[PDB]
Structures are given as C-alpha cells and as structure tokens.
Write a protein that binds this ligand. Structure first.
Ligand SMILES: Cc1ccc(I)cc1
Ligand SMILES: [Cl-]
Length: 162
C-alpha cells in the first residue's frame, strides 16, 4: 500500500463530472473543479486543467495525471506549512499517508481546526489523537472514510484498507 492506492480506494474513479459528498463538481480521482453551482463554470475549469475541450469527460490517463498533480500539491502544502511540517516529519511512513489523505480531502484550511489533534499526534499519543479526531464535522459527515484514516493514525498499519 502507498498514498496513491489509499486515495484511489477512498475517492474512486469517475471519468465524467460528478458531485462530491458536499455537492461540489468533481472529476477523476476526487479532483475538485469548483465550488460554484454552475456546471458551465465546472466545464471551463476542466478544460483549463486538461488543456483541451473535454465537454465534461476525460480519459483514464488524464485522470491519473491530475491525481499525481493533486497528491504532489497536498505534500507540498504540508511541507510549506509551519504548523503541519513538524508534525509530518515526526510521523512514520504509514501515518504520513493518513496525513496526506486528510489534506487531500480538506485542504490546509480544512485541517486548521485540528490543532489539538496535531499536538497529540506529534507526542505519539495515538489513542487520544484518535478520539480527538473523531470529535469533528469530518467524522460525522464522512464516517467510513474518517474511520479508515483514524484507524491508520491509531495503529500505523494498513489494516483498515486491507
Ligand atoms: C489533521 C492533520 C493534518 C495534518 C497533519 I501533518 C496531521 C494531522
Ligand atoms: Cl464515508
């Protein structure tokens, strides 16, 4: 298992524009296009991202390239953030994947509310961090996804994905 296989399981693959769990236009392996309600705005964002007139549909190769770009961007966001980088650097490789997963889903701003969880993770208080992470809108809105990610933080294993 690696970060790409983990996120592919959590996000799935769709080659036509779809709506995510919050109702936002998305394509590929969880690539957010826009938070605007306008399908035309989403199609414009798609064409700009891919570099051709897609009319709302992409190829599997295109989805996989967007996905590589999005994972790279999540990692770079962690490394440039003075609050996230020291926590990330303290984690083992499996728990680092759980961190990337959360940033991929919620972005740097979405993780800003997890300040107490970050401190517990840096101190390697895994059970306490797991409870704190579950006290969140994230866990209440996408509980199965959150349970897999939290279990990965708690155990440092891939058991929730196997
Ligand atoms: C919630 C969370 C976000 C970033 C890191 I690094 C660890 C935990
Ligand atoms: Cl879920």
């Amino acid at each position: 298992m690696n970060i790409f296989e983990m996120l592919r399981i959590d996000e799935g693959l769709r080659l036509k524009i779809y709506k995510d769990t919050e109702g936002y236009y998305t394509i590929g392996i969880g690539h957010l296009l826009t938070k605007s309600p306008s399908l035309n705005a989403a199609k414009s964002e798609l064409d700009k991202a891919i570099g051709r007139n897609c009319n709302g549909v992409i190829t599997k190769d295109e989805a996989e390239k967007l996905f590589n770009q999005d994972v790279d961007a999540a990692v770079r966001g962690i490394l440039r953030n003075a609050k996230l980088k020291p926590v990330y650097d303290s984690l083992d490789a499996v728990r680092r994947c759980a961190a990337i997963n959360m940033v991929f889903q919620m972005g740097e701003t979405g993780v800003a509310g997890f300040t107490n969880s970050l401190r517990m993770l840096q101190q390697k208080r895994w059970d306490e961090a797991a409870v704190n992470l579950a006290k969140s809108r994230w866990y209440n809105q996408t509980p199965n996804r959150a349970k897999r990610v939290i279990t990965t933080f708690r155990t440092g294993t891939w058991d929730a994905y196997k």
